Symmetry: D2
Subunit: 471 residues, 4 copies
Amino acid sequence: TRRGKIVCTLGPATQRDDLVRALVEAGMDVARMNFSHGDYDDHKVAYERVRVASDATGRAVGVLADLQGPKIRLGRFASGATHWAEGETVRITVGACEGSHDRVSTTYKRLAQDAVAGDRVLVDDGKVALVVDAVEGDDVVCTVVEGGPVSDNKGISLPGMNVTAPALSEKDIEDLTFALNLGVDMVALSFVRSPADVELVHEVMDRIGRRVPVIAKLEKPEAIDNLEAIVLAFDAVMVARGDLGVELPLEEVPLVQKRAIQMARENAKPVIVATQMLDSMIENSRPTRAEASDVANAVLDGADALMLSGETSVGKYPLAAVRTMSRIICAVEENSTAAPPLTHIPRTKRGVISYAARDIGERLDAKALVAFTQSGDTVRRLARLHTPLPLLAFTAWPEVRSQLAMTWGTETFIVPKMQSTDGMIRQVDKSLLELARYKRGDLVVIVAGAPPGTVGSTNLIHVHRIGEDDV
Amino acid sequence: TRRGKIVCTLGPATQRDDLVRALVEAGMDVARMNFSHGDYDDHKVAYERVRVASDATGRAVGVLADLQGPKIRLGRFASGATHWAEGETVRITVGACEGSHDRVSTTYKRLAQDAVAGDRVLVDDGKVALVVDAVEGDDVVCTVVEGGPVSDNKGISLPGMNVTAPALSEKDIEDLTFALNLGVDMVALSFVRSPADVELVHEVMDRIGRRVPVIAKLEKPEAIDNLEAIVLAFDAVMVARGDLGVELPLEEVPLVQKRAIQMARENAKPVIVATQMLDSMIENSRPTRAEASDVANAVLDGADALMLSGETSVGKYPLAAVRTMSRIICAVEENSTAAPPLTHIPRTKRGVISYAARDIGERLDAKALVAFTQSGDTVRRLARLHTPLPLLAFTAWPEVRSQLAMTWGTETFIVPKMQSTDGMIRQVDKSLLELARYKRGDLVVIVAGAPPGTVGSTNLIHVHRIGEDDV
Amino acid sequence: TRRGKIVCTLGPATQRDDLVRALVEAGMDVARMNFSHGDYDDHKVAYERVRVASDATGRAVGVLADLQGPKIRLGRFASGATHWAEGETVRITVGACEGSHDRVSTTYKRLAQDAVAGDRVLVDDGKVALVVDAVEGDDVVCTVVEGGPVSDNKGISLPGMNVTAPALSEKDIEDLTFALNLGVDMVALSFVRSPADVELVHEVMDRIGRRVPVIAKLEKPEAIDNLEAIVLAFDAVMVARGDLGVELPLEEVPLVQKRAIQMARENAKPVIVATQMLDSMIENSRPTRAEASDVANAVLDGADALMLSGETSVGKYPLAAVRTMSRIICAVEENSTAAPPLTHIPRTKRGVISYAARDIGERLDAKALVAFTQSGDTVRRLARLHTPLPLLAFTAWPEVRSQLAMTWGTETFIVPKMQSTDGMIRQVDKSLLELARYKRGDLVVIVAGAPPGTVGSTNLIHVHRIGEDDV
Amino acid sequence: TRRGKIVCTLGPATQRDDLVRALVEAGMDVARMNFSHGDYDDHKVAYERVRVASDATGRAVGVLADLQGPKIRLGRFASGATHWAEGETVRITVGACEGSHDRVSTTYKRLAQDAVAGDRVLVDDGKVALVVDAVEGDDVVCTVVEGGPVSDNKGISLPGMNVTAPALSEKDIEDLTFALNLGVDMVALSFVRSPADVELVHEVMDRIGRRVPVIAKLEKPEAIDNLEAIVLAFDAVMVARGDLGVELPLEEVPLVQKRAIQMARENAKPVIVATQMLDSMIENSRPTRAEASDVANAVLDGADALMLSGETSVGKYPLAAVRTMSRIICAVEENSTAAPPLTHIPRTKRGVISYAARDIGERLDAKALVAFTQSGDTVRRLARLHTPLPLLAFTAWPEVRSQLAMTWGTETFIVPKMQSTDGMIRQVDKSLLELARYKRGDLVVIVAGAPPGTVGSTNLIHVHRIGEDDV
Ligand SMILES: Nc1ncnc2c1ncn2[C@@H]1O[C@H](COP(=O)(O)OP(=O)(O)OP(=O)(O)O)[C@@H](O)[C@H]1O
Ligand SMILES: Nc1ncnc2c1ncn2[C@@H]1O[C@H](COP(=O)(O)O)[C@@H](O)[C@H]1O
Ligand SMILES: Nc1ncnc2c1ncn2[C@@H]1O[C@H](COP(=O)(O)O)[C@@H](O)[C@H]1O
Ligand SMILES: Nc1ncnc2c1ncn2[C@@H]1O[C@H](COP(=O)(O)O)[C@@H](O)[C@H]1O
Ligand SMILES: Nc1ncnc2c1ncn2[C@@H]1O[C@H](COP(=O)(O)O)[C@@H](O)[C@H]1O
Ligand SMILES: O=C([O-])C(=O)[O-]
Ligand SMILES: O=C([O-])C(=O)[O-]
Ligand SMILES: O=C([O-])C(=O)[O-]
Ligand SMILES: O=C([O-])C(=O)[O-]
Ligand SMILES: [K+]
Ligand SMILES: [K+]
Ligand SMILES: [K+]
Ligand SMILES: [Mg+2]
Ligand SMILES: [Mg+2]
Ligand SMILES: [Mg+2]
Ligand SMILES: [Mg+2]
Ligand SMILES: [Mg+2]
Ligand SMILES: [Mg+2]
């Protein structure tokens, strides 16, 4: 089956009866809750539907809370939408107004203070483009240079204007508190600029009394300048290509994507590739040739996971988008699971051992590689290598199963906390033998460590036949 | 500047005054004339505008005639378009009718004879999908399973039905005769199935008294099964992804593309990647993130050329599409021009020498590699290696400059037919010194051969400083 | 700390008091008893001296019995010796006689049947050389082409002649029986031609009720033609260069040596390089520059062990020969222990695991690699890789310590037969902690297997700090 | 034919009529005249014999003058010789005396100033070894620790002692002047310590009005410390292993040899390996197995040339030594000519071009590589790569044929000084067609350069069939 993981975004198109369940059955590995839209009622109902579907199907499904961050947005228009045609003059004001075609509010109250004639304003990830002609009091008077539809609350980007805004707003802190209390498994922070942004997220977590893994969304030039330090400081990264391709020239995104995936893999951190991967499937039952190519290539690049956004959250074909994505991933994988080589030989005990375990398993034609992990680290150091063999994570901590839902090629088994590596190995046999897929005599390579129940203790590789007396 | 080449398709959107010139100035290297649409009048006018723009600007621009081949199409509808909604019953008839929503003709008169209940019909490259429920006389009665707009003369595909049709129709033969007489530089054949299809094109050429290079369009499973024999028999290939992704499962196209590019390069034949590369730019001023990725990745795969279809032929932003494609190509190339390694060390004289010349030029930091070529072969064997150095083809045959417009990284200089390699080398200096960018003393590596004026005689590498007495 | 092993031959020069002890202290790893000379009382006394010296010093010292094999010899002369000068005619007869200058017997009773005019006869491996002129009945009439002294019972070689003789003589069977009863640790058979020769050695061993490892001496063209089959069938090989360079052209020996070493290593069998390595030290206190080169190059080639023959058995400087050999080996090793790479990836469990263990130990900067072995196999699969790390073999079978005396880079510890791998690991700590050079906390990589006490069960790698609670 | 070159030393054993001729016919490529022995009449006679044999046979044979250098020696003894037995006390004095057993002079007048108790004195490269006990005025009082015969004027070594002495003695200057006037083709300087030593040799040469290539003999630790600077400053190097293995611990010589060969090859300088390669052939018709190994391994190491000293100058088997050496070299080469890879990609024009020429010739299965060279450089840059193809140097300067006698794999053809590269190529055909080995149509790769007759102008590679009109 499929090795690469699929992240789907929930929203209006997944709220109908049984759709969340249908996404899980179709292969969704991680459900994204985007706090840019919806209210707390919405997110709670959707969270519950994911947990139910996961427990009903037996599939691991992680829940990712995506914080909106310092997003700049337009306000509302009188009819909900308008058309900004090339050549029209429009006013974006930092004051109060009822929006109309001619004049609309913005959430960024420093716009009129900071804008200068010549500044570019890109709406909705570049659908519409304006240029500032002047500032008159609270109004930024613009000419539409590239025309298109605009609608209530659309995002704007001010590339090459330094935005001043806190990494977490008050809304983000409330959303994060709600999400932590609700029980989500990971958190993604939009518009990360610095490795120190993770410290702000940790502050909230520690006050509330609950940490979960933090994903840095990469969608700002500062993020790319600080890429390595960000990969090191956060638990995972997302190539957030929508905003990244307005904040940077869109032609620079493909090589940035590949750099970011490679860096994540070298550091054994999960990487998600996001946004417009199957964009046309918002309206169409089949994707474009560029879209299938983009999905295939993100697999070949070495991504742990690929994300669907509007394709599942608002589109007409959410289930078909998941199925289509999965078909493309599998077609590539069937040819080969190889990723680009890592440029450093592993140095850490866990890396050295996971690398050796892969060697042994492949050369002896084992049926699976099995790794015990308390934090996920030992398994992540193996997963990033890619192997055509099944990779079976064993843990005692249920949250680790949901966290590993985003890690390449990995399925997780929850077992009791054991007091010995012999016990760990017995648990492997018990768990695997309950599956139709495994039988007595099957060769597996098991990575474990003593002292038991200690992060980082990984220190043994055992070649084992299931149920046989070889321990 | 840019190494990878850009093919643009001409049509209604390029017919406005001086748009063809504007495409040339924006970087179009090859203009595609698609004989599926337009009048002979239209193609003549467009051909002339390309020749004028090429001579006015001094840029080489090849002209490629694309023959429609055994395309199956719907006929016309009463108002020019209709909507086929999911659940509707429609009739595709092999008999005469004015089309309406309910019933429309097809050009494939064997449809009712060859269709069986359960056969799938995909319209317009998969935008609409039908299933055959029965055949009643001349009518194939279908249910729309995936709905969408359809319009006059849209193509249909019958994947998993053996289509019987000649590789060249009467219309194709007329079009090819017209194109050869008009003076086009290359010909592309749609729906190639066999290496022997090239000999049918050669038959027409030889009767008319004029050969030009033949490109096999790859858009049938048979073509991919016979890929190597087709690359060997034709002069070039096009990955025609529109039809290929209906004739094959769309998820199989990305690896096919990569295989086809590699095979072309191993055999020193040009390869063009076509269709939907910047599809959304038909309506939008900026492409999707999948589209920029697809363009970048086709560069990384090693393609000589990338093609725009509707983006230039019918779309709202033909100039922007060319500029955008060029920006993406350049962004990748600025990072590196490396292509995947060839799997064979060169064994032919021309291959061995072009490979050596590249070594010498790169290791001595030469300002350019220069190769004399009568057929293009010596230059193509170098081009396929990729090198960050300029690659300057010298020839006495003007058509070779237009043909090499589709070959990676290559600019061509027309010079007189010379009687010695010393004379060839003097012509290099004369030609290059007329350019602002070259001066006396500049180090160049020159590949040439005696006997002069003989295809394949390539047998010398000379390291030369322009204008210096070192020959 | 020298890794490569040294084999020394006992004889008249080692019989004087305390010399055998001094050899052991100087580094002798294996003592060779050459059954071509000496009586049973001699060999018994020498055997006892080796066992005492080994037990007194604590150093493992293997005892190797070298069987003479089907050696062809001259008979006796009336005056005990004569001079065969260039130009003289001599008769070698298959009849019995007391010899004279003109006519002497040979032990090879088929000489007159098998020799033809033009055959070469080399005496004493090539001081005296004759050419056969004719066969008259029992007499092979020869012309001396290179003159010199000959004496009773000197060996002769018939290079190029197909010699028909049993692999074991009656004398060999008696000698082997005496050596097995005496308690020697391995046996070498001279003049091996076929893999089936080992079967005759095994027959004797099984009748006597004691097997030990069998080394094939390689000194016949047939042996080299059947090299792989012989390496597979025997337990080890010796490049017996003295006779090899008479039976084959001497100029072919260096590449044969290198081939044989590589083959032994690919199959995890010990290889000894023998004969004339420091030949001039029979008379001189320091070797020639060719000799030092020969020793260094045998190390670089990947030999487990190097042998001294006359340098220790009859020479004036037996101790200095051993010390000098050791200094040369250590000088090379101090630069690098690298051997030529093996040409295939390990395929067996023991090979795959020993290869992984090496990776882990080197990458984690372990103080030693430790491997449990019942037959030696697991340790031999590691030894042949070469590693700058100490390689510590652990076993319960004392003979394995003596056998592994000829294996590259390996020291062996005898411990009790254990009932668990945890027990094995505890024995490692107990044994190592008794050494000054290991301490608590030292990192080691341990290879072991369950079920315990079973050849081939090797199935675990444990990274362990000595005395720490990490099992 | 043989690729590696053989240097032989002339002396008493080659003085008998027609022996020098027989050496040339047996394959001697370079004749060494050792100015440590013989008078000027001897050297003149031997020089004449080499020139006659070279011209009569048509084989290039270089003549190498080896200067004695700052060799330290004993003085004379009253009885011409004495025996210095282990245990006795001897005085080596810096004062003049006719010696006796108890007290003998030395030529090194700083011995008493520079020696200290504990210093070793080795006579004759270490048959006799003394240890210094005391310095009393002019006398160095020593204890003999290894006994043996000593005689008038025997050499001594003071390993570890900093010897202060001029690089050229007055005798060396006289010898060098005689050798230059006589017409020798290159000069070797013994006991080189510094790159600046070449400057003193050049001083003499410039005063006399004749330069030839200078070879640094490497036989002092200072030389090895300054190895790269010495290789760069001199025209070639000789690994002078006799003295090197006394001045340095003999166990360090094998890796020094290999380092020196590699360094010479990286810098395209000839390297000769010297001394005791077939030492036992001074008395014996066949060498030891160590000796054959030493010769083979010097070939595999990448040496241009191997040298015979006493084996040809004083031994009983000078011709057999040469033939035996040649058979061993050829046996290795028949298997493969591969040398260790160079660690740098070639950077100079001549290196880059010679490397490319090799590629082309091997890939196109050319019959030979041909290179024009005025100084030897272009050919040396190719030779050091090793190729199984013939390497044919073409030059107009007769001395270059004698100089290239010591360069790996190279035969040299003298042709007129040409005014064009076309003329050079015609000379190739004329010269080669006179050989039985080459015929019209044979494919060769030719390296040449314009401006003609200029060192370093190498700038063209031409693939040519002999006698065909392809230039
Ligand atoms: N124990 C011994 N007694 C008498 N002579 C010996 C003995 N060992 C070796 N020799 C002789 O001394 C010479 C050199 O010894 P060598 O290096 O050949 O050891 P060896 O080859 O194992 O002995 P051998 O060749 O006789 O089997 C040979 O002539 C050999 O016959
Ligand atoms: N079920 C379990 N019982 C005991 N220890 C476990 C269990 N699962 C994982 N571990 C520990 O987790 C370690 C690896 O953790 P990590 O460094 O986060 O990969 C192993 O060495 C085990 O000791
Ligand atoms: N301008 C020219 N004059 C003479 N010969 C040419 C010219 N241009 C190319 N050639 C020949 O074309 C050969 C290479 O042709 P091709 O094999 O098609 O690459 C060279 O070896 C030249 O002999
Ligand atoms: N002291 C010992 N106690 C128990 N088993 C041992 C001991 N030493 C070696 N072994 C066994 O020998 C096996 C390796 O043997 P071999 O395949 O011959 O290298 C290991 O798997 C161990 O089970
Ligand atoms: N017979 C010759 N006639 C003219 N030039 C020669 C001849 N032989 C060698 N050369 C020159 O020697 C150059 C290479 O010399 P070098 O750099 O010393 O190897 C070539 O470029 C030629 O120009
Ligand atoms: O937030 C995102 O996912 C983006 O911008 O692409
Ligand atoms: O023909 C084409 O270009 C296609 O099908 O994409
Ligand atoms: O038997 C031997 O040792 C030999 O011949 O070298
Ligand atoms: O000078 C030499 O030839 C030596 O010392 O080896
Ligand atoms: K968000
Ligand atoms: K023997
Ligand atoms: K000398
Ligand atoms: Mg978005
Ligand atoms: Mg974003
Ligand atoms: Mg199309
Ligand atoms: Mg098509
Ligand atoms: Mg023997
Ligand atoms: Mg010397």
